[PDB]
Symmetry: C5
Subunit: 98 residues, 5 copies
Amino acid sequence: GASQFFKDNCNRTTASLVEGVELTKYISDINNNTDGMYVVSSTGGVWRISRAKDYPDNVMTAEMRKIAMAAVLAGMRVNMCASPASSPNVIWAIELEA
Amino acid sequence: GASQFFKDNCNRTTASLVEGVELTKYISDINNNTDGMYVVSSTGGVWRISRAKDYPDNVMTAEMRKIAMAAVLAGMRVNMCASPASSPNVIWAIELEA
Amino acid sequence: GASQFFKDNCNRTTASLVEGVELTKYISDINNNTDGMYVVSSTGGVWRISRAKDYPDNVMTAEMRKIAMAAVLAGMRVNMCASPASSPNVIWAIELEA
Amino acid sequence: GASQFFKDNCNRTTASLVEGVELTKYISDINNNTDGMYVVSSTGGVWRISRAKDYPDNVMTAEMRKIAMAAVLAGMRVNMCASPASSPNVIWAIELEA
Amino acid sequence: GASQFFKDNCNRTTASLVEGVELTKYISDINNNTDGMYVVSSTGGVWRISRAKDYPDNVMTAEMRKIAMAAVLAGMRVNMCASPASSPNVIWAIELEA
């Protein structure tokens, strides 16, 4: 379950906490209409990972993509802070667990 | 099989949906006229990975390369949206599946 | 147990040595005020990974992220030299132990 | 067995095909006059991995280094298109086999 | 044991060959005056990994970090060509062994 720290930081925002998601697909598409990379859960939910060219968000967004690939490869769960103002909902923070 | 999201995205393009491919070889080639990154399926189908010079597309092509190499290492399947305009067909989108 | 080298180096500083920590969650956040990379231990303790825009510190901070991810994926323990000046405490050095 | 695609491509070149190589060592060296990245096979043969500073070859040579490492860590075989011009022979294409 | 090629190259330098080293710790430090990347062996021996900003040594030194980290995670041995002129001794070449 989400760390107290992660839930606290989500509840400072207007986003929604989604806990224990099992990501089973990870998508890279070159279409110019994308807003980043996408992950799909075992129940068919889709979320987007944002992109940023410069420091510092170029670090966090890369580590979001590393978390997604490690969660899909190993069957690890994640918790998400996801904003419903975009569709697919955009990930503002992600926690990989165990 | 392809998420609905990935299927819908491929249908907005001229490229073809190829589902459930088992990639078994990953090629890097710097020779004249054949330079590129390619993947080979267990039955001998060949595709070229997209390439891109600049941000944002070079983030997307880096993640395709990571997806294709992870699929080959782990024996995981991928779904592809691949363009028939050249041969080998060029992967415009890829979905790693667990 | 922390190498004597790592302990000697942390003894030069105002930070504190934390030994044998089991990291169980890895967080990337781009929210507006809590952005950063963090790790959470099995007891719920939280640390922020150092960030640096330029060479050479951006080499070491990238390896701190790689160490934190590998520790969470593998259940490998780490030793930290962590500054109590902020909450979460900032990791200024980390040792991955096999 | 190398894919026919990889054999056909190598056969366009002045390089030679080496199939089914088991790489057991991976070397990085920054000493004068020996600097480079190299691989050594189970029988003791040595190859240099190509290098390139610029796009697009900087992509393919980085993938060559990822393939080499993965082959050595997992005991996977590779097929190589290697130029006999210099010693060690330089890898111009490589195919990782699962 | 070290390849003949690795040994021949190290014998050309002022550095020492160290064979069969079992690395068990990997350190990243950004503290003043002790900053750097380091590895520690099962005996307590400590080495500094070379670093470089510019091409081409930025490639080799990144691969040295990847070799160190892989050796620690998987308990693989390395061979090193390490200079005694500094403490910790600096790694000028490294060979990962399967």
